[PDB]
């Protein structure tokens, strides 16, 4: 509630339905908590700052607070944060509290009984006692990880007294990652659901370690006795490179377990007895181990019928280069398997019969096989994997056939990189491979491919319309980081159903001058929608115009359009005129010092998104914008403009997203925003503007403005801008960083003063 | 003769034995020829400048000139250079003349009969007539190439009248490269020795084309009907991709031919009848052709018993990936073959039996096989090639086994890149290959290897002293652009005879902090002489000191020595102290803002070459140089020093090569060079110095100075430096760019004035 604040430098978000008020003071360099904080707020953000300590009077009048965040307030900085006694007892409605990165020595006392979450990561608490945990009898989620490890050493092994967590009957999630823990803290409460003991120094597991945990769902034991070969981070192998000793009858009481992580445990064998009782396991991680021989046997896979995810990445043997992948026949028992990763299983040749166990997996979607240094791989063997969604053929050497400060979620699963080409259907990610030329015979029996990534292959070829013949249903093609010779306009002609084409980073042949550059090759593409050819350094073009009846988006950044539009050369003025359906242009970083007269007349009639960022436009004309009757998102950021148009209404009748970020403008015209009621977005940040007059900023236009930025510039706070001073502190226009970034240059003592906090009584 | 010049801005070189005087005015921006040119000069250099034309009075008093160079005086610039009539008749002793890059339309007339060389490259002369060549009856070398091609088009085919060169009885070398020539200009004089007709549009060769040439030694026919696939430069294939039609009885009259180039001719067959008469052929070029099938036959090789060089690079077929290299059995007839290049013959697997024809070549030294995309290659097959000097295993994908403005020489042969490792003996250049780990078994039967290049392989391995076991006689090892984990001090221990080690560009594992970095691994290397570990970004080291009893040169540039020598950290102060025999150090680009006191005491006793370039030394102490009793070549270029030492004699008693290039020094001490008789080299260029006093620059010290630089700085030419003005124009000290780079800041009209050309009579 309370809607209107007075001088708070933190953003306020109101949710009437949720009855939640959010205050975000992230990255504000506040030495002390600012005054005037509303009593109706629910979430308080007090992240990285210069707060010396915490006082009971800080939250004296705040009784509705339900979330306090104090993450990374002192990253190892002055002395450690000190908390006065009874500093949290007054928050009866408190439910969540974060104290990560505060260099605390012991668990704070006096916490309210209503607390449900407590985070104490990146601290110096290496001792756990029941006396300090007595007050936390109603806690549900506990985060005590990253207290003693290589980044934040403490030189003392973690000590937990007997039955420390036993009386925490409400505990559900416990994390002890990177805490130098040697022994699992028995006895954990029976209500635990997620346990995170990974990246510790645990060497053995007892048979009664998880005897009472029946509701556990997620168990993590990574980093115990890890595989330290070629590790880019400090780690200590266990002795004799022994594996993490886990008894056969260890996961017996676990019946609701769903996620089990054993990554980087130096395991050599996986007994089937482990998975005898856990019949509902969904995700299993076994990466960074020594299970190369176990993959050939994989006898334990017969006890996982409901498995969804299986990770076996980077299990290669030392000084061993396998001739082929030895997949066990027990892989056919993974009926519900969806994602499979066999990376780091480096081998020479991949054959069709080696993937036979995966032929009957109906629910399999993703097959990851990248980073395996595969030399010989017949692509026609994938004709049986039509139901697969993503097939990974990454940096391995396949060649053509011959003749705590952020992330409030804390413990979260690894989110897979959702590439832009996955949404189009079947994907064959052949990026960074050893393919140096394209044959139509190689891609035979692959008409089902809706996607094909070939970035980084460094292919030097002159396509004439026959290489991608079998790819009849291809919709997305990636050809970045290659050497494409556009000597013919018939390239990609046989890709009838292609929609998006990426030929970026092909600067090699485009840099050479005097050779033909057929830029009209998009005419044959009937259903092409997006074309990305940026960072190509295109300086000449044999074709006068580019023709396309369906292209809508075109990226032409990082090229040389100045030479194409050189003074006295009108050949390429109407280069984009024939693109009738084009709606977005991205001609940026083209070293365009100036725009010759006539280019705007040659722009497509349906242009709607024009960008000229980072170009260096010394003088950009504005009366020529009348030609563009559909322009809405003109962008001139990071340019060297110096003059605003006399009347924006006379320039464009539809511009609504004008941007002039990081420009050099010292003053605005007296009628800059006169009768411009169609404008919605305006940006003038990072400029050299001095003052704004009333006649240039009418309130009628400013009322409908969604967002306006005037931060990080050189406004002068003198008596000549009383109207501006009154308006900035009495309007509802959303101006970000109003009290943090925009300051006053002068005069004299007014350096660094906040405009919204200015009250010139003498004026 | 004449020894002493007056105001010439060109360097003068005297050779009394050769009676030659050389004047070099290269890159001087001279609008007109300067006055005071000696009459005794022999060679005149008048390269790229702003000379408008040539007048007869330019060489009026010069009668001893024997060489005039006028190369690239106007690169397509004002209008073309105009030569007045009878502008060269007065040079009776002229023998050589260069007029390249002058946009001349016709051959200049009135040349003296004593001329022997004439260069007219990069001009607009596309018509040749006997009338203009009548005056050149005594010429020997003619250069008329690059007159009409893609860089300098003329849109007209070259026209040569019948028997134009017939009467040039003294002609020996003729070049017509890139001249758009269609037909060979019959009839060439019988005294021709070198003919250069390459990069032309010749489509056919007549049987009488070379009927009279019996003394010809070098013949070039490249670029005629060229192979235009993947060409980074403009080219036009002949029609029907027809080959250059050469009759069988074409090289019949040629008996002294030694070099024949047929590179890029789209040839398909090489008849043996071509080489029936040329029994003394030494170098043969057949690259960029379609002789992939001909290599399997190679019937013509039986007629080349005296061949020395054979080039067959880049003859791969389009859309064909050969399974193996098909070398003909006729290769055994090349008894005298020394260098063989089979690059661009892309094939999958290389076997031992495929190199059988080369097993009996006693004189074979270099075997080039790079850029072939070889996948499988057993390195043990090279045990039979012990006599070979260089074996090329370049960017192909071999993996470990599984289970006119310059170049006055004009027409010159392609100089092979002499790598630094070739001088050590047998070389196995395995750079940029697909090797990702090293096994001792792979390098078996290779104990004869004196060199091994492994740069760019990106090998991630933790060597412990057993990988390079069979390489007992290895002396040079290259490991640049890799990922070396120095977790053990026993690395390279088994390389007993190693002398030079290069572990540069291994920044990956060295960037990580907290992992061990055993920098004392050089102790085991008993005979190590040079160690290059630059660009490694080394910021921490587990070993306190580096020990080596034989290391003499150490490159440690592009690292982080500031953190190692951080204030309050004296652990790594004596890092290089134990290097007893070290004589050269290259610690540069280390971001060293300042040198903590004590590092000089920890320097090796026998240090002689110290470099601190591009470091950013805000304040470098000088009294600590007394510790180094053997310093001679101290370098502080591209630094931010501001104060010179009070007395250089008191600092170092052996410094003789002090360098302060691109520094920021405004003034020198009044006793900077007092009693410093041991100094030989001094550099103060690109500084902010204002004036020099007499007491700081005694003549006794300056007499023995070999070289001194005071160019491109901010000297002020007022009346306060009369002594300096007198001394700079009356001393014999070699001061480069004395009248071209060093100018006067002021005062007033004295901007840009030459100090050596200053005469202040009013002073
Ligand atoms: C202001 O502070 C409030 C608390 O003081 C915040 O309310 C919290 O909001 C989160 C959601 O953002 C709730 O989390 C719930 O989690 C359960 C369990 O889901 C678990 O599993 C999923 C994966 O399937 C995982 O993503 C979750 O993180 C959990 O691990 C869900 O079923 C719920 O729908 C909900 O997501 C908290 O319970 C809730 N706390 C309280 C006390 O209600 C509020 O978000 C804060 N607002 C801002 C703007 O920061
Ligand atoms: C000043 O101008 C003088 C002429 O006006 C220059 O004298 C010339 O010097 C060059 C050497 O630099 C002489 O070239 C001769 O070439 C023959 C034939 O060798 C040929 O083959 C070799 C490869 O085996 C090749 O490298 C050569 O370039 C030749 O193509 C050699 O046998 C000789 O030893 C010598 O190298 C000229 O003959 C000579 N000209 C005259 C008229 O004597 C002088 O070099 C100029 N000085 C400077 C500093 O520029
Ligand atoms: C995780 O806990 C283990 C518990 O052992 C820590 O190992 C201990 O580390 C300290 C500090 O390096 C060792 O103290 C050392 O003692 C030697 C004398 O033996 C002394 O010369 C050193 O200066 C240092 O004080 C201690 O011995 C060692 N414990 C054992 C059993 O070896 C480990 O450091 C902890 N990890 C982190 C990141 O804090
Ligand atoms: C085809 O495959 C290539 C390589 O696998 C993909 O390129 C990679 O795309 C990812 C995601 O866009 C890039 O990650 C990003 O890197 C930047 C730094 O450049 C970082 O700031 C981002 O946060 C993100 O991590 C990755 O760099 C890029 N790799 C290269 C070599 O460009 C490409 O996206 C694939 N194409 C399709 C259509 O899936
Ligand atoms: C090397 O010599 C050949 C000799 O044929 C040159 O080919 C000629 O090039 C000119 C200029 O492009 C052509 O003139 C053209 O004529 C057409 C009408 O046919 C006109 O529309 C053009 O505007 C141009 O004026 C000429 O036809 C052509 N000759 C032949 C037989 O095709 C070639 O250009 C020369 N190469 C260089 C680098 O100068
Ligand atoms: C081992 O093989 C590698 C690659 O074949 C050699 O590196 C290459 O060395 C040459 C000659 O030093 C470099 O050429 C130079 O390039 C610079 C530009 O960086 C240019 O300014 C010079 O004029 C010269 O052309 C080449 O760049 C370099 N390649 C790489 C990737 O570094 C290496 O020298 C070999 N080692 C031994 C001991 O022979
Ligand atoms: C694939 O892996 C399986 C299981 O490790 C291998 O089968 C074993 O092979 C060894 C060596 O011959 C025998 O001693 C075992 O008795 C075999 N066990 C079983 C259950 O068959 C198999 O040889 C591997 N195949 C390949 C090609 O490496
Ligand atoms: C990859 O596999 C496919 C199919 O298994 C092979 O296609 C065969 O090609 C030959 C010659 O073109 C035909 O005679 C066969 O009938 C094809 N097989 C089928 C099932 O139709 C292809 O040759 C394989 N690739 C390589 C390099 O061997
Ligand atoms: C596209 O390029 C391919 C590759 O060169 C052409 O295929 C060749 O065509 C020529 C002329 O008909 C034949 O002599 C070759 O035998 C063909 N090679 C192969 C491997 O088939 C193809 O004709 C070109 N297409 C167009 C329209 O230019
Ligand atoms: C793209 O433009 C080029 C010209 O820049 C077109 O090439 C011309 O094609 C016609 C028709 O065959 C020929 O008569 C011309 O001689 C060609 N000119 C050149 C310079 O090659 C090409 O056809 C265009 N492609 C498309 C698909 O429109
Ligand atoms: C290596 O090259 C030789 C010469 O081109 C090949 O020998 C020819 O092979 C063809 C095809 O079988 C025959 O028609 C010719 O009669 C052969 N000529 C001779 C002189 O033998 C040979 O087959 C090639 N070998 C490989 C493995 O490609
Ligand atoms: C590369 O060639 C060498 C020699 O030709 C092979 O060395 C053989 O290795 C086997 C098993 O180690 C021995 O039984 C043979 O006696 C060796 N040959 C000789 C001549 O001694 C080596 O195996 C080959 N590499 C590969 C990958 O096959
Ligand atoms: C250097 O590293 C190699 C590779 O690990 C070591 O060779 C292994 O040594 C262990 C211990 O003796 C054996 O169990 C392995 O069988 C060996 N592997 C191979 C491929 O031989 C070697 O011992 C190490 N040497 C030193 C001095 O540490
Ligand atoms: C290089 O220096 C390291 C120390 O930085 C040496 O490692 C020590 O070796 C001794 C002898 O075995 C051990 O007692 C120490 O515990 C080792 N210290 C560490 C930190 O590992 C290493 O031996 C040195 N190598 C050489 C060749 O001198
Ligand atoms: C123009 O581009 C911006 C870029 O963020 C986008 O937000 C906007 O929706 C685009 N406008 C149209 C009409 O597509
Ligand atoms: C020191 O290095 C320079 C670098 O050019 C070299 O010329 C000089 O000979 C070296 N001095 C000694 C004594 O090796
Ligand atoms: C400087 O040199 C003079 C003359 O040799 C000597 O007397 C004096 O002690 C020296 N001072 C230092 C600090 O070296």
From TrEMBL, chains A, B:
Subcellular location: Endomembrane system; Endosome
Family the entry assigns: Belongs to the Toll-like receptor family.
Glycosylation sites: 40, 43, 180, 326, 378, 453, 464, 520, 609, 650
UniProt KW keywords: Calcium, Endosome, Glycoprotein, Immunity, Inflammatory response, Innate immunity, Leucine-rich repeat, Membrane, Metal-binding, Receptor, Repeat, Signal, Transmembrane, Transmembrane helix
Residue pairs linked by disulfide bridges in the UniProt entry: 10-25, 72-405, 74-77, 148-154, 225-238, 228-235, 421-451, 717-744, 719-763
Gene Ontology molecular function, alphabetical: double-stranded RNA binding; metal ion binding; pattern recognition receptor activity; single-stranded RNA binding; siRNA binding
One biological process term in Gene Ontology: canonical NF-kappaB signal transduction
Binding residues annotated for guanosine, in chain numbering: 373, 397, 485, 516
Chain positions recorded as Ca(2+) binding sites: 759
Name assigned to this protein: Toll-like receptor 7
Leader peptide range in chain numbering: none
A single Gene Ontology CC term: early phagosome
Residues of the full protein shown: 27 to 833 of 1049
Domain of life assignment: Eukaryota
Entry membrane topology: Single-pass type I membrane protein
């Amino acid at each position: 509630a309370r809607w209107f604040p007075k001088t708070l430098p933190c953003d306020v978000t109101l949710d009437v339905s949720k009855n939640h008020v959010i205050v975000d003071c992230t990255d504000k360099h506040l030495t002390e908590i600012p005054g005037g904080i509303p009593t109706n707020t629910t979430n308080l953000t007090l992240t990285i700052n210069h707060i010396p300590d915490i006082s009971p009077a800080s939250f004296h009048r705040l009784v509705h607070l339900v979330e306090i965040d104090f993450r990374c307030n002192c990253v190892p900085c002055p002395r450690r944060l000190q908390i006065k006694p009874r500093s949290f007892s007054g928050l009866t409605y408190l439910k969540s509290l974060y104290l990560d990165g505060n260099q605390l020595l012991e668990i704070p006392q006096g916490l309210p009984p209503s607390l449900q979450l407590l985070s104490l990561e990146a601290n110096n608490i290496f001792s756990i006692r029941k006396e300090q945990l007595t007050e936390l009898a109603n806690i549900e989620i506990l985060y005590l990880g990253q207290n003693c490890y290589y980044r934040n050493p403490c030189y003392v092994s973690y000590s937990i007294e007997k039955d420390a967590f036993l009386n925490l009957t409400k505990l559900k999630v416990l994390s002890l990652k990177d805490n130098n823990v040697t022994t699992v803290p028995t006895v954990l409460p029976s209500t635990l659901t997620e346990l995170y003991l990974y990246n510790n120094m645990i060497a053995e597991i007892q048979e009664d370690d998880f005897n009472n945990l029946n509701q556990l769902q997620i168990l993590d034991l990574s980093g115990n006795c890890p595989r330290c070969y070629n590790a880019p981070f400090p780690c200590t192998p266990c002795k004799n490179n022994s594996p993490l000793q886990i008894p056969v009858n260890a996961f017996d009481a676990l019946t609701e377990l769903k996620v089990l992580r054993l990554h980087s445990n130096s395991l050599q064998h996986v007994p089937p007895r482990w998975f005898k009782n856990i019949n509902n396991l969904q995700e299993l991680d076994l990466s960074q181990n020594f299970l190369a021989k176990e993959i050939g046997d994989a006898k334990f896979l017969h006890f996982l019928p409901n498995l969804i995810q299986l990770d076996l990445s980077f299990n290669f043997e030392l000084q061993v280069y396998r001739a082929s992948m030895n997949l066990s026949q027990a892989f056919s028992s993974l009926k519900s398997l969806k994602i499979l990763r066999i990376r780091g299983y480096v081998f020479k040749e991949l054959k069709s019969f080696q993937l036979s166990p995966l032929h009957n997996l109906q629910n399999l979607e993703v097959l990851d096989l990248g980073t395996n240094f595969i030399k010989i791989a017949n692509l026609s063997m994938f004709k049986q994997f039509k139901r697969l969604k993503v097939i990974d053929l990454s940096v391995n050497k396949i060649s053509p056939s011959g003749d705590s400060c952020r992330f409030k979620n804390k413990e979260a699963s690894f989110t897979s990189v959702q590439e832009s080409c996955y949404k189009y259907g079947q994907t064959l990610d052949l990026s960074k491979n050893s393919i140096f030329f394209i044959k139509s015979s190689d891609f035979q029996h692959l008409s089902f491919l809706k996607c094909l990534n070939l970035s980084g292959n460094l292919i030097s070829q002159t396509l004439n319309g026959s290489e991608f013949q079998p790819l009849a249903e291809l919709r997305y093609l990636d050809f970045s980081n290659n050497r494409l010779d556009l000597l013919h306009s018939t390239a990609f002609e046989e890709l009838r159903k292609l929609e998006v084409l990426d030929i970026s980073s092909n600067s090699h042949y485009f840099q050479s001058e005097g050779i033909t550059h057929m830029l009209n090759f998009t005419k044959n593409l009937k259903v092409l929608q997006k074309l990305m050819m940026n960072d190509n350094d295109i300086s000449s073009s044999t074709s006068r115009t580019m023709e396309s009846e369906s292209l809508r988006t075109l990226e032409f950044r990082g090229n040389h359009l100045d030479v194409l539009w050189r003074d006295g050369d009108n050949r390429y003025l109407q280069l984009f005129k024939n693109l009738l359906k084009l709606e977005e242009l991205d001609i940026s970083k083209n070293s365009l010092s100036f725009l010759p007269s006539g280019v705007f007349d040659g722009m497509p009639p349906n242009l709607k998104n024009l960008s000229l960022a980072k170009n260096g436009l010394k003088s950009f004309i504005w009366e020529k914008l009348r030609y563009l009757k559909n322009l809405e998102t003109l962008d001139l950021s990071h340019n060297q403009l110096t003059t605003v148009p006399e009347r924006l209404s006379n320039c464009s009748r539809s511009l609504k997203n004008l941007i002039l970020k990081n420009n050099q403008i010292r003053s605005l015209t007296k009628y800059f925003l006169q009768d411009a009621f169609q404008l919605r977005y305006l940006d003038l940040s990072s400029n050299k503007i001095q003052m704004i007059q009333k006649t240039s900023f009418p309130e009628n236009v400013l009322n409908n403005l969604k967002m306006l930025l005037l931060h990080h510039n050189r406004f002068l706070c003198t008596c000549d801008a009383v109207w501006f001073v009154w308006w900035v502190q009495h309007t509802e226009v959303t101006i970000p960083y109003l009290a943090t970034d925009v300051t006053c240059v002068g005069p004299g003592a007014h350096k660094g003063q906040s405009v919204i906090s200015l009250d010139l009584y003498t004026c």
